[PDB]
Design a protein around this ligand. Sequence first.
Ligand SMILES: Cc1c(C)c2c(c(C)c1O)CC[C@@](C)(CCC[C@H](C)CCC[C@H](C)CCCC(C)C)O2
Length: 251
Amino acid sequence: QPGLAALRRRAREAGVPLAPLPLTDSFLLRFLRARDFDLDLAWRLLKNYYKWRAECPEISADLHPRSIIGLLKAGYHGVLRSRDPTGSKVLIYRIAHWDPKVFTAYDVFRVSLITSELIVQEVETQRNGIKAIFDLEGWQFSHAFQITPSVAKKIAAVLTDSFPLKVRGIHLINEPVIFHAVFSMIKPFLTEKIKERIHMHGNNYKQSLLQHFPDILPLEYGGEEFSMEDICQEWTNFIMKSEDYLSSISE
Ligand SMILES: Cc1c(C)c2c(c(C)c1O)CC[C@@](C)(CCC[C@H](C)CCC[C@H](C)CCCC(C)C)O2
C-alpha cells in the first residue's frame, strides 16, 4: 500500500516504542487508512497515538477488561451488529449505567479505548469510520465532577488526531440542561471538523436518530429487532473473549 514502507522506516528511525504493538503491515495500515494514505498525516497520527498513550497511562497501560468488567455488566455499552448506511461501525454508550461512585472517568474512558482497539482491527471500520451514540439520560453532577479539564482535553484528543479511527459522527440524545457546562469544557479543544459532526438531538430524538440509523437501532431507540441488553451482553462477551489480545497490547 502507498507509504507503508516509508511509514515503517520513520517509526523505526524515530525510535517509536519498541513493543508492544509490532510495526506489522496490519498495524501501520490503520494509520494510513485513517488519513487516506497521506503519509505525513498518518505519521503525525502515529506519533500522536504513542504520545497520548504515554501521557495517559491511567487509561492506556492496562487494557485487560478486568478493571471495567463491572461497568460492562452494568449495561453501559454495546456495539450494533450492523453498520450504518455509510458502513460505519456504531457504538452506544448509556450514561445512566455508569455509577460514578464506583467507576472513575478513567475507567469509563478505558471502555472506549478497549472497544476502539478491537474494532480498528476491521478493515471496513478503518475505511468507513465509526459513529457513537451517547444517551445522556440520567447525567448527574457527580458525572460532571469526573470531567476535569485534563479529561476534557483527552476526550478531544482521541476524537481528533490521537487514535486511528475516523469519527464520522457523535450523536448525543436526551441531553439535560446541566450537561451544557460539560460540553462547553470540551468544545474549545475540538477541531471544527469534529464540532460539525456532533449532533445534539435532545429529548425528542427518535425521528432524527432513526433518519441517521435506519433499521439497525435497538428497541429502546426506535429499532424493532433486538434490545440493548442483547447487544450489551454480546459485546461484553466478545470483550471478555478478547482478554488476551487486549493483554498483548497492554503493558
Ligand atoms: C478512539 C475513541 C475513543 C477512545 C473515544 C470515543 C471515540 C468516538 C473514539 O473514536 C468517544 C468516547 C471517548 C472520548 C471516551 C469518553 C469518556 C468519558 C468519561 C465519557 C463520559 C463523558 C462524555 C463527556 C460524554 C460525551 C462524550 C462525547 C463528546 C464523545 O473515547
